[PDB]
Design an enzyme around this catalytic site. Structure first.
Site, mmCIF file in Angstrom:
data_model
loop_
_atom_site.group_PDB
_atom_site.id
_atom_site.type_symbol
_atom_site.label_atom_id
_atom_site.label_comp_id
_atom_site.label_asym_id
_atom_site.label_seq_id
_atom_site.Cartn_x
_atom_site.Cartn_y
_atom_site.Cartn_z
ATOM 1 N N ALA B 421 0.714 -1.193 0.028
ATOM 2 C CA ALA B 421 0.109 -0.037 -0.021
ATOM 3 C C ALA B 421 0.927 1.316 0.014
ATOM 4 O O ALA B 421 0.672 2.230 -0.951
ATOM 5 C CB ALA B 421 -0.713 0.053 1.238
ATOM 6 N N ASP B 449 6.266 -10.307 -3.242
ATOM 7 C CA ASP B 449 5.050 -10.555 -2.922
ATOM 8 C C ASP B 449 3.935 -10.661 -4.036
ATOM 9 O O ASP B 449 4.184 -9.822 -5.298
ATOM 10 C CB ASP B 449 4.343 -9.831 -1.934
ATOM 11 C CG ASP B 449 5.121 -9.999 -0.605
ATOM 12 O OD1 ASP B 449 5.904 -10.931 -0.454
ATOM 13 O OD2 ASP B 449 4.748 -9.083 0.497
ATOM 14 N N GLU B 452 -3.546 -10.120 -4.350
ATOM 15 C CA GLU B 452 -4.858 -10.949 -3.851
ATOM 16 C C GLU B 452 -5.774 -9.954 -3.341
ATOM 17 O O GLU B 452 -5.324 -9.235 -2.266
ATOM 18 C CB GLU B 452 -4.447 -12.134 -3.049
ATOM 19 C CG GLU B 452 -3.388 -11.788 -1.800
ATOM 20 C CD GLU B 452 -2.711 -13.050 -1.323
ATOM 21 O OE1 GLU B 452 -1.993 -12.830 -0.187
ATOM 22 O OE2 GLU B 452 -2.853 -14.104 -2.042
ATOM 23 N N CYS B 577 1.654 -21.184 30.615
ATOM 24 C CA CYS B 577 0.581 -21.580 31.739
ATOM 25 C C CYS B 577 -0.787 -21.381 31.324
ATOM 26 O O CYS B 577 -1.611 -21.914 31.473
ATOM 27 C CB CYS B 577 1.308 -21.486 32.897
ATOM 28 S SG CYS B 577 2.386 -22.781 33.429
#
Ligand SMILES: [Cl-]
Ligand SMILES: [Cl-]
Ligand SMILES: [Cl-]
Ligand SMILES: [Cl-]
Lengths: 153, 983
Positions: B421, B449, B452, B577
């Site tokens: 962009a 890239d 899409e 955890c």
């Protein structure tokens, strides 16, 4: 944040041998300063006191903006260490910055061995054993220490 | 979750009209259209002219003489198939405006017409916005009318937190050292607070921030007496605001400022801009002609009189700024891509607020200049000749900078990393700049890239016709369509910029360059390019956006910090955890669900296939694998289950539901009961430990149902019971039929009672009996709603949320969190790119005064604009030789031996090398033991590296960076630069 990762690593390694922490050794691989081999002595007056424990440590791409990765290699009976070497460590999780360093992680692990924390458990079985059956769990930790850890000098 | 909807989906009420379609108008319209609105209508009957092409990127020389509004409509329509773009045939009387919800008046509308249009819109209940740009100057004005209400001022997620202690008086203290993140005056509600009953009913409380980990509420003895627990949630209360008309505001303006250091100028320019129109009135519609002192002093007089007509604009005792207004007159005719893009994004966002109700509007005037972009007049004189037109599309840039500086822009050599962009907006600005258009200039854009689609045709260089092709190539060709002067000057590569490509992007490549610009998100690429620019001493232009927030950073050799020196800390990671057993936020359940997806549908299939195809799989896995048990259990379960019908896939999903949301939970509560007390003596389940309850499967609960649906479908994929083909709008009846006839094994708490591995391997089946058997692993595709992936993650997370009483999230919100989708909107992208292109001018003039540069930050939600002097590079000193910690280094000829290096440093610099490394490899250390030291001290660096890495240099290398630690003349440690070894 530092301008260079290997520079930071160099600075920490020099100071690890210059000003070592008692009971702990930490030495990198010559062909990869991002992998450290570590050993920690079991703290005196604890289940682990007659053993020496092996750990791998790794520094990720964005260290020291990102905390080190640590895994136990020695099999160990502990509320906060699981079967694959993973550790729940208060320093690893929430509290990290460039100000903290490998030294602080190792001190923290050593202290976790001295003072286990089943209240915030990772190995839930060992935590149950430690809360309900403390003396027995400690005894199993002793047995495992001499069984799986290496002996001290 | 989403971007903004429900009561804030008023943009599908909203028809926008834009008057004037030069560069400002198109930038605004493009941003709006890309965003999405009910309709865009444009109006510009004036004929195209060559000069117009300075910033108006949709116009070509074929269009000269035709109406701008006609020739721009088709290209704006291309941008969003869901937004109709019309042309207003004619604007003859004001009532024609009543069909629009927002009207925007740009630089083509006379102030007289702006006052008329605005009085009409304000009194009629229509939102008005205006904007103008004048060379390196600009302004905007917002007037959303009498009664506008702000229901979502910041747009950010409502802050929440867990309470530890609340007294009879306010003082709400948090749990275990946590930020509330609230500011003074905020309002909060409470939930789960025990004791203080009706304090949980939704009532709001004003918040006095007495500490970063506590805040004040007031008297709470009437609701009850605090017992334990609780959660607070911020709520944003409405705010009613009034806008004054344009005429009221012309003499009593309310400013939003653009720069701390320039506060005063806003009142000056407010007059200046007005005088400009007053000038055009007297001079048959013309602005002050360029660099003309007669017209300049006429403007000074017009402003000087306007001051007396509007004493409240400057106040008492404040003088008119001759020099500022003089420059305004000089630059009146200018048309600068950076300023036009800045105001395009800014103003487009204000229009979208006026359409949506989101965020806090600008109230009401903002003025801006970038005069420090001006080069040194010594270097580049500015007068009526140097600045004069030349019958080119760059004439209104020459108007400000002069022909010679503009020629230097043409003959610049620039490297742009990334064609996303920001990269696309950058190539657009550069096309309009004619950057790298001269015979001695060029551009290199590189991105590996592919294209899409996002949602509703975002991206104003990429089209449906372009899907699958490279970003860099399509972007380069698009901007060449906008400006042919750049045809054959854009070198569009598709390489990755990192260590793996240093023979393509080598010494020569980098040293040719004038400067570098980064248009990449991820931190790795950014730190690498930044360190290259530090190595080759090149300037770097950095930018970033995060939704409505954005920033720009300049990195100047021998002058400023680098990007890596100040980069932000990466996002918190979820503690293991909490993840495994004690979630308290939907983020934890989402992450856990993703893990489970990986294991169920990807890892297990890969493992089964390896075991069936490879002959020594079991032996090898025994030899070298940490989780041997996990791998073998996965395989054996995958092969012991063997579903033959989709019936069994449904049954498998239902049994997994029981295992994960009933039995595992019951096992957890077995280990630690709900009233179990720690060794401490306090409860085990306190704080962020919420005691779960096991679920009872209910097919009419949406999450249970869709867990079964998605899991059964994906397992059916794994075992080839259904490929990408199934009527995926299911009925509860189909699944309820299967599930009601199942026997569900009761919970057996497994306290019932080398060695285990041998039993596992004994269990494994003989591959010969599974002849021709294969599992098809799934690949997590989030941007496909057919595939059940987000369905599974949403439902799995939500069932676990039901366990621990965490509130569920829908598919879109789950997709947002699970994808780590970082927002990219057109407004902020265009604005930040504009600011970068304004600092670029300072690079062209090779400025070295750090006060001339501007690092920028914006938050278009508030809206907030701020600029700050770049930070000077830190500097040190080891033996009274002071140095630049970022940029300075040592230089060494030839493949010197390590011993010669050590000796050279002891003699020349006084340093005692303690450590030396090349990249990741440690080559020498002070503590190395004798046998080790001797084999290395006499080696050349290249061979030293061959020894440690056991791999020789690729040979294309000519230079080598080396990090070192050393002590000084005393023997104590000192900080020092890095070393460049030139081979
Ligand atoms: Cl005008
Ligand atoms: Cl109040
Ligand atoms: Cl909006
Ligand atoms: Cl030119």
């Amino acid at each position: 944040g530092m301008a260079s990762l290997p520079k930071r690593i160099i600075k920490e390694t020099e100071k690890l041998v210059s000003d070592p922490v008692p009971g702990i050794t930490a030495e990198p691989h010559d062909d990869n300063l991002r992998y450290f081999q570590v050993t920690i002595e079991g703290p005196e007056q604890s289940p682990y006191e007659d053993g020496i424990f092996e750990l791998e440590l790794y520094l990720p791409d964005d260290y020291p903006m990102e905390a080190p990765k640590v895994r136990f290699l020695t099999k160990i009976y502990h509320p906060n260490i699981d079967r694959l070497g993973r550790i729940c460590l208060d320093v690893l999780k929430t509290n990290w910055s460039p100000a903290l360093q490998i030294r602080t992680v190792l001190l923290s692990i050593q202290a976790l061995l001295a003072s286990p924390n089943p209240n915030d458990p990772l190995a839930n079985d060992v935590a149950e054993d430690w809360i309900k059956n403390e003396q027995g769990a400690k005894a199993k930790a002793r047995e495992w220490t001499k069984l799986y850890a290496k002996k001290k000098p | 979750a989403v971007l903004g909807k429900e009561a804030m989906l008023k943009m599908q009420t909203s028809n926008v009209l834009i008057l004037g379609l030069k560069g400002l108008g198109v930038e605004i319209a493009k941003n709006v259209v890309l965003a999405g609105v009910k309709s865009m209508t444009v109006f510009d009957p004036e004929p195209v002219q060559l000069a117009d092409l300075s910033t108006q990127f949709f116009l070509t020389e074929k269009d000269i003489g035709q109406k701008r509004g006609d020739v721009t409509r088709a290209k704006l329509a291309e941008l969003n198939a869901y937004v109709p773009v019309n042309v207003l045939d004619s604007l003859d009387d004001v009532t024609q405006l009543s069909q629009f919800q927002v009207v925007v008046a740009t630089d083509t509308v006379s102030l007289e017409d702006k006052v008329k249009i605005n009085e009409f819109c304000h009194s009629s209940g229509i939102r008005f916005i205006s904007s103008e740009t004048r060379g390196l100057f600009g302004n905007t004005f917002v007037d959303l009318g009498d009664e506008f209400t702000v229901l979502d001022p910041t747009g950010e997620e409502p802050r929440t937190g867990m309470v530890s202690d609340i007294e009879p008086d306010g003082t709400v203290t948090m749990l275990d050292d946590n930020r509330h993140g609230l500011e003074d005056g905020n309002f909060v509600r409470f939930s789960e607070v025990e004791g203080l009953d009706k304090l949980n009913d939704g009532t709001l409380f004003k918040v006095e921030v007495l500490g970063p980990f506590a805040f004040r509420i007031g008297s709470v003895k009437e609701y009850g007496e605090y017992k334990k627990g609780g959660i607070f949630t911020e709520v944003k209360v409405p705010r009613k605001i009034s806008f004054k008309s344009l005429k009221q505001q012309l003499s009593n303006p309310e400013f939003v400022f653009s720069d701390f250091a320039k506060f005063d100028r806003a009142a000056q320019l407010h007059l200046g801009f007005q005088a400009l129109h007053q000038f055009a009135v007297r001079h048959n519609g013309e602005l002050p002609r360029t660099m003309n002192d007669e017209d300049a002093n006429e403007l000074i007089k017009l402003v000087t009189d306007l001051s007396v007509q509007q004493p409240e604009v400057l106040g008492e005792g404040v003088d008119v700024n001759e020099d500022l207004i003089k420059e305004l007159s000089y630059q009146a005719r200018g048309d600068i891509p950076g300023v036009v893009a800045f105001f395009g994004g800014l103003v487009a966002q204000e229009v979208l607020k006026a359409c949506s109700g989101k965020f806090t509007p600008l109230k009401q005037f903002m003025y801006f200049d970038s005069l420090e972009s001006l080069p040194d007049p010594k270097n580049f004189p500015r007068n009526e000749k140097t600045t004069q037109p030349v019958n080119s599309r760059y004439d209104n840039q020459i108007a400000v900078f002069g022909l010679d500086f503009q020629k230097k822009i043409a003959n610049s050599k620039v490297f742009l990393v990334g064609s996303g962009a920001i990269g696309c907006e950058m190539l657009k600005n550069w096309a309009l700049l004619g950057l790298g258009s001269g015979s001695d200039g060029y551009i290199v854009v590189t991105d590996n890239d592919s294209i899409e689609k996002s949602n509703a045709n975002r991206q104003f260089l990429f089209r449906p016709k372009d899907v699958g092709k490279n970003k860099s190539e399509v972007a380069a060709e698009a901007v060449c369509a906008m400006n042919p002067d750049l045809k054959g000057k854009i070198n569009a590569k598709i390489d990755k910029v990192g260590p793996e490509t240093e023979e393509i992007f080598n010494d020569s490549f980098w040293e040719s360059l004038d400067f570098v610009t980064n248009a990449l998100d991820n931190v790795d690429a950014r730190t690498y390019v930044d360190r290259r620019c530090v190595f080759y001493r090149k300037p770097l232009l950095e930018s970033g956006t995060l939704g409505t927030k954005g920033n720009t950073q300049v990195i100047i050799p021998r002058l400023t910090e680098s990007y890596s020196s100040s980069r932000d800390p990466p996002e918190k990671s979820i503690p293991l955890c909490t993840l495994r057993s004690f979630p308290n936020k939907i983020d934890h359940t989402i992450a856990w669900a993703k893990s489970l997806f990986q294991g169920y549908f990807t890892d297990s299939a890969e493992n089964v296939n390896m075991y069936l195809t490879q002959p020594n799989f079991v032996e090898q896995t025994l030899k070298q694998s940490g989780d041997v048990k996990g791998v073998l259990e996965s395989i054996s379960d995958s092969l012991s289950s063997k579903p033959h019908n989709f019936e069994d896939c449904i049954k498998w999903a239902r049994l997994e539901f029981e295992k994960k949301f009933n039995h595992d939970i019951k096992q957890l509560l077995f280990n630690f009961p709900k009233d179990a007390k720690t060794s401490n003596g306090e409860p085990f389940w306190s704080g962020a430990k919420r005691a779960p309850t096991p679920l009872e499967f209910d097919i009419y609960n949406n999450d249970h149902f869709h867990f079964v649906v998605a899991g059964a479908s994906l397992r059916a994929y794994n075992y080839g019971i259904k490929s990408d083909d199934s009527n995926s709008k299911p009925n509860v009846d189909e699944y309820k039929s299967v599930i009601d006839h199942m026997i569900i094994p009761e919970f057996t708490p497994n306290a019932n009672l080398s060695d285990e591995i041998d039993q596992l391997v004994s269990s494994l089946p003989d591959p010969s009996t599974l002849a021709g058997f294969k599992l098809e692993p799934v690949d997590f595709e989030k941007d496909d709603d057919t595939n059940h992936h987000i369905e599974f993650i949403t439902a799995c997370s939500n069932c676990r949320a039901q366990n621990y009483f965490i509130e569920t999230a829908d598919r879109q919100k789950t997709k947002f969190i699970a994808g780590r989708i970082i927002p990219a909107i057109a407004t902020t992208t265009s604005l930040v790119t504009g600011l970068v292109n304004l600092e670029l001018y300072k690079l062209i003039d090779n400025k070295t005064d750090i006060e001339q540069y501007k690092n920028g930050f914006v938050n278009l939600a508030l809206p907030f604009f701020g600029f700050s002097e770049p930070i000077a590079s830190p500097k040190g000193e080891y033996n009274n030789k002071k140095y630049d910690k970022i940029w300075d280094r040592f230089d060494i000829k030839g493949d010197i031996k390590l011993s010669d290096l050590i000796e050279h440093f002891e003699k020349d610099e006084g340093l005692e090398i303690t450590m030396l490394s090349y990249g990741v490899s440690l080559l020498y250390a002070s503590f190395f033991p004798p046998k080790k030291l001797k084999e290395r001290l006499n080696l050349p660096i290249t061979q030293l590296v061959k020894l440690v890495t056991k791999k020789d240099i690729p040979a294309h290398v000519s230079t080598m960076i080396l990090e070192i630690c050393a002590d000084d003349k005393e023997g104590e440690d000192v900080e020092v630069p890095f070393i460049t070894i030139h081979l």
